[PDB]
Each structure stands twice: as C-alpha cells, then as structure tokens.
C-alpha cells in the first residue's frame, strides 16, 4: 500500500508465552507511546507528545479481547504454534565516534518472531546494565517485529562492546561486536 | 524450545496528501498469518484465510459493528492526524554531515527527522552516481534517522569531492568537502 504517512492506532499484541501483551501506537514507524499494562499507565516516547492524554483503560480492554481471540484460535488452528525466525542483529553508533565525546551504541534486532527476546550488552566481556534501555517491539508489515537496544557510552580506545542476543530461532546467543 | 501462540491486532491508517485520501485497514493476525481484515476501501470484513472466516462472517452480520468500522476512518484516522499535524509532522531535526575515508569515501548523515532526505556525491563540479551506494534509511528508534552514502573513487591530483545534503529541516543544502 502506497501512502505519504502510515500509522497504527494501535499495535495490539498478546501471546501465550508469559503470557504477555503490549499496546503501542506508531506513526511512520516510530513509537508514540506504549501502555504499561501492569501499572495501567501511558508512557510517551517523544517529549512533545506528553501534552496528550491516552486512558490506559482503553488498552486494557483491547488486550482482554485479544486474549479471548488467541485462545479461540489456538484450537481451531489445531494448535499451530509460532515458527521461530532467525533475527538479524546490527550494532552501530548514533553519531560519528570521537573519543571523549558522549555517544550512544545502538543494537538493532530485526526479523524477530515470536516477540520474545533477550538483548544484553557486554562491556569488555562482562555484562553491564547501566545506561541501557530499549524500545518496545516495533511492528513490521510482514508481521514480525524489531526491537532496538541502547547503551550510552564515552568512546575510548580501551573499550569495546558486544550486543548479546538471545532468541529461540538461534542455535546459540548471537554476539555482535563493536569497537571505536 | 518452548512453544508460543501469538495474536496481533493492528489498527492502521494510510494517509495521502494530508487527509485528502485516507485508507483504514484493521488487521487480525494469528502468529504471522493475517486471517481477517477490515479495509475501508472494501467496506466490510473479509476473511483472508479459512481461520478467519467465522470471525468475518460473524462481525459482518452485526450492522452496528459494521457502521462503527465504516466511520472509523473519520473518527479515528482523520481525528488523530489533527494531533500529528501539531506534533510529529512539525518535528524538524537537522542532519550532521561528516566525510571519512574507509579507495572508498563515506559520507555519514546522522540524526535527522523526518525521513525525506537527498544525499549526493560530486567529484569536482559533476555528480557521481555510477560509483555510489547508499545504505537504506537507518532508524535510530528515537525519532531520528541516519544514512551512510559511500563513494568508490580513484583520486587524481586536484580532485575535490563534495557530499551534498538536502533535507526539509534546512533552507539550503549542506555541503562538506574532502581532498586526497
């Protein structure tokens, strides 16, 4: 479908594993907000959008419908489970690297299905969690997902990183390396 | 490997030329298989696979559900676009342009929004296209993009290479030069 702008109002996901759901709105492929279902709280992902109001109850109601539909479909499909795809992992910096100027490492995990994944960061062989954050699962037109993880850092010759990705479609945790 | 059963519901709007042309497609998706959708161009639910046939049949038989779906293009899509006009569609972030050799010259254009951008390489006064390859748009996930545009060159004496960048956030092109 050709269009100047595409939006999802919203992307509703529910899956048996967990189980767990996710409610987001996307505009032109970027996440506007997500509803934290457990806390019943809307979380805006772009500052200018904080002036808006979206009642988390609306998302709870939709996710409840999905849960009911999923269970209807499992049986009718003769318990056809999700196929595990091989995700593709790419690691890059937000801006050109100059040593001693703050930057962000970005780990793009694409072609994710099913949407269950562990993305971690290793700083010199050991796991780190400070300065780490990530997007929700973002939708794609083939109905798989992508997710992006971030690591804030100060580039230096003496430090290298790996993005570590765990997913059922992989034989072993995939490790993507980065150096300045 | 544990099994997962996945359900997705996407409420999508496709905008062309503002809200002059708006198409709504809601998609119900089992695992990765779209099974039913409502396309405002068609005006009723249509099953996509046998799995979604009883849903479509059932949903279509409810005249009130149908009337609500038919009005959703105005109630949801055109309504939310008015919010986008004040926010997402006004967002302007200016690209940074940097030239670095990897022979192969790389022009990095980082941290811009929106997506519409044009990067050109020039050798002296003439555009290079034969020996140019650009990454696709790279989505940073935080409402900025970057793109890498690469030039294969055989630098002769006195050659001046120019990376030329046009983007809606600039009144004039950004130009950065490089000499062997």
């Amino acid at each position: 479908i050709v269009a100047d702008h595409v939006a999802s109002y919203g992307v509703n996901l529910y899956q048996s594993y967990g189980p767990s759901g996710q409610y987001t709105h996307e505009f032109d492929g970027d996440e506007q907000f997500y509803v934290d279902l457990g806390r019943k709280e809307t979380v805006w992902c772009l500052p200018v959008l904080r002036q808006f109001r979206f009642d988390p109850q609306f998302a709870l109601t939709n996710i409840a419908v999905l849960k009911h539909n999923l269970n209807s479909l499992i049986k009718r499909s003769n318990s056809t489970a999700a196929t595990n795809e091989v995700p593709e992992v790419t690691v890059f910096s937000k801006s050109p690297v100059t040593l001693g100027q703050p930057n962000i490492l970005i780990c793009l995990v694409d072609n994710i299905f099913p949407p269950v994944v562990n993305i971690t960061w290793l700083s010199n062989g050991h796991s780190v969690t400070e300065g780490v954050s990530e997007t929700s699962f973002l939708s794609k037109s083939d109905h798989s997902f992508f997710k992006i993880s971030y690591l804030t850092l100060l580039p230096s010759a003496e430090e290298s990183y790996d993005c570590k990705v765990e997913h059922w479609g992989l034989d072993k945790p995939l490790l993507k390396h980065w150096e300045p | 490997s544990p099994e997962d059963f996945v359900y997705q519901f996407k409420g999508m709007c496709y905008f062309t030329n503002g809200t002059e042309r708006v198409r709504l497609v809601s998609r119900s998706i089992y695992n990765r298989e779209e099974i039913v959708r409502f396309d405002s161009d068609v005006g009723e639910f249509r099953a996509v696979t046998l799995l979604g046939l009883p849903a479509a049949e059932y949903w279509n038989s409810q005249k009130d559900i149908l009337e609500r779906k038919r009005a959703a293009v105005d109630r949801v899509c055109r309504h939310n676009y008015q919010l986008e006009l004040r926010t997402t569609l006004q967002r302007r972030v200016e690209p940074t342009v940097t030239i670095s050799p990897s022979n192969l010259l790389v022009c990095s254009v980082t941290d811009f929004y929106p997506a519409q951008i044009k990067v050109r390489w020039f050798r002296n006064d003439q555009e290079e296209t034969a020996g140019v390859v650009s990454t696709p748009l790279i989505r940073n996930g935080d409402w900025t993009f970057q793109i890498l545009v690469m030039l294969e060159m055989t630098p002769q004496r006195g050659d001046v290479y120019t990376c030329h960048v046009e983007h809606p956030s600039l009144q004039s092109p950004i130009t950065v030069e490089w000499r062997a």
Binding site: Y9, Q51, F52, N62, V65 | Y58, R68, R75, V76
Partner: peptide, 12 residues
C-alpha cells in the same frame, strides 16, 4: 482534542 483515539478489537 488532546486525545488520540484507537481502533477497537472485536471479540470472536
């Protein structure tokens, strides 16, 4: 409005 609307999922 300062209120985004959403499309409602329907029960099967």
């Amino acid at each position: 409005m300062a209120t985004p609307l959403l499309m409602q999922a329907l029960p099967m």
